[PDB]
């Protein structure tokens, strides 16, 4: 029988597939019984996924009870139907397979806000994304993620709010908190062709909207000019950032602490100084954050 | 199958549209304009002041609600007025609830 799951538009859903010790090592799956009799399969354990669910399905690892779980995120209006986890060998829906259905409903009357799904960053540039989270659940431990396929179904932790950043991202990465009252910002610069992908805004809250944002690493030129790898250090801002407040950081696992400088007049735009690990010279627009570039 | 062009909820108009994929002849497909007004007929003119005259004219310019004086209450938005009720000495002007089950504070 159905196990009705009323979820939200641009929210997420967790299918808790619990099966038995007869079907532990059988190759589990999740079809989606559509308008005829066929199941257009969505995950597998032997490899497959969908052209649709790219970046979003997370097939969690098995337990000792065989109770693997599946996360879908960013649900859109065309996911609103019967889903079916099951355990047959060749990963298609066949008879003899201990299935266990569900039933979604993706309501369109959401209270979830509409964050942009595609962040476009130029190579060696800057991205600054906001992940929304439940305004009741303000005091909780944020996290972030990568994307690694569905048959893997992985999402290892890049940063958090307690402080621990991965070592291969240090210097170019900072989780923020401003603006509060609903959001939390993450700034990532010093981009790369292969660090485009699907990036999940976890939180340690109770009801979770695992927002997935998509980094598109285009070709480009940096919007900000900084020395290569360097007592005064300059930072050269374009004239589009005229309202934006120009400031330097001292990066650590604790984020940005302020460091003073003095402003000039017209400079071929704007130029600031660093009179005096890794440090940046980003911009700030009132309460949000924009383009930062890193230096040694 | 259809796409909502307008879902206006203070006049209660609801213009949608839909292309009818016809009998499989050439492109003699039709396009629609499914307007769906719902006329109040007991709401006042000033919707919030309920001491106003009733209504006669209901004018729906369907450009000027595709891009005010509302005719219906919206269901989610909640409406109030202030009345001079007394109880003894004072005339304590307290704040009523025209449409209830929407003005419940959290």
């Amino acid at each position: 029988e159905p196990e009705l799951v009323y979820e939200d538009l641009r929210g997420s859903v967790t299918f808790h597939c619990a099966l038995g010790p007869e079907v532990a090592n059988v190759a589990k799956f999740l079809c989606r019984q559509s308008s005829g009799e066929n199941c257009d399969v969505v995950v597998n354990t032997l490899g497959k996924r969908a052209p649709a669910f790219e970046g979003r399905i997370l097939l969690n690892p098995q337990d000792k009870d065989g109770s693997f779980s599946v996360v879908i995120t960013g649900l859109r209006k065309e996911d609103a139907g019967r889903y079916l986890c099951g355990a047959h060998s060749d990963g298609q829906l066949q008879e003899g397979s201990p299935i266990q259905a569900w039933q979604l409903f993706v309501n369109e009357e959401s209270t979830i806000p509409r964050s942009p799904t595609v962040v476009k960053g130029v190579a060696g540039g800057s991205v600054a994304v906001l992940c929304p989270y439940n305004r009741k659940e303000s005091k909780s431990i944020k996290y972030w993620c990568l994307w690694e396929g569905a048959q893997n179904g992985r999402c290892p932790l890049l940063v958090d709010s307690e402080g621990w950043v991965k070592a291969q991202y240090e210097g170019r990465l900072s989780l923020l908190e401003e603006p509060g009252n609903g959001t939390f910002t993450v700034i990532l610069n010093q981009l790369t062709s292969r660090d485009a992908g699907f990036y999940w805004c976890l939180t340690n809250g109770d009801t979770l909207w695992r927002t997935t944002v998509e980094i598109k690493i285009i070709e480009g030129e940096p919007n900000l000019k900084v020395p290569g790898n360097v007592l005064k250090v300059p930072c050269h801002f374009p004239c589009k950032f005229s309202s934006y407040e120009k400031y330097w950081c001292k990066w650590n696992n604790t984020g940005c602490q302020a460091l003073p400088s003095q402003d000039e007049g017209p400079s071929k735009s704007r130029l600031v100084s660093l009179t005096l690990g890794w440090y940046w010279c980003g911009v700030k627009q009132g309460h949000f954050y924009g383009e930062t570039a890193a230096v040694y | 199958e259809r796409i909502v062009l307008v879902d206006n909820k203070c006049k209660c108009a609801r213009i949608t549209s839909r292309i009818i994929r016809s009998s499989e002849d050439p492109n003699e497909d039709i396009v629609e304009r499914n307007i769906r007004i719902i006329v109040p007929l007991n709401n006042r003119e000033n919707i919030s002041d309920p001491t106003s005259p009733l209504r006669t004219r209901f004018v729906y310019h369907l450009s000027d609600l595709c891009k005010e004086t509302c005719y219906t209450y919206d269901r989610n938005k909640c409406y109030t007025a202030v009345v001079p009720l007394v109880y003894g000495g004072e005339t304590k002007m307290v704040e009523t609830a025209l449409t209830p089950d929407a003005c419940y504070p959290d």
Binding site: P2, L4, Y6, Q103, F105, N107, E108, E109, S110, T111 | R75, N76, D101, A102, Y104, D106
Partner: protein, 111 residues
């Protein structure tokens, strides 16, 4: 489309009891507005069998209760003592009977 969502198909033997949950988008109107469970008959309309304000019809008296969990975001209809006149076409919904905001449960009792 109307955002209530219940069970589309319910099966239960005569004498046994039914629990039918229907969900709503937990707004502050939908927490507090009237929640019904009407029987869509033939030749017309809902006949409210058990509202949530406190009406309970002549038929469902003593055998039904509708409760409302507004924080869970749902309302649940318990009906004991089924018979085969309890088969047919029902709606669980909010607000007025006519104006949509509903869902269509098809109750189907077996012997």
């Amino acid at each position: 489309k109307s955002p209530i969502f219940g069970p589309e198909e319910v099966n239960s033997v005569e004498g046994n009891s039914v629990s039918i949950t229907c969900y709503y988008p937990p707004t502050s109107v939908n927490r507090h507005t009237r929640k019904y469970w009407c029987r869509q008959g033939a030749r017309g309309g809902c006949i409210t069998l058990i509202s949530s304000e406190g009406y309970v019809s002549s038929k469902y008296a003593g055998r039904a209760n509708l409760t409302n969990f507004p924080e869970n975001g749902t309302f649940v209809v318990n009906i004991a003592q089924l018979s085969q006149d309890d088969s047919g076409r029902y709606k669980c919904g909010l607000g007025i009977n006519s104006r949509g905001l509903s869902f269509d449960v098809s109750l189907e009792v077996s012997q």
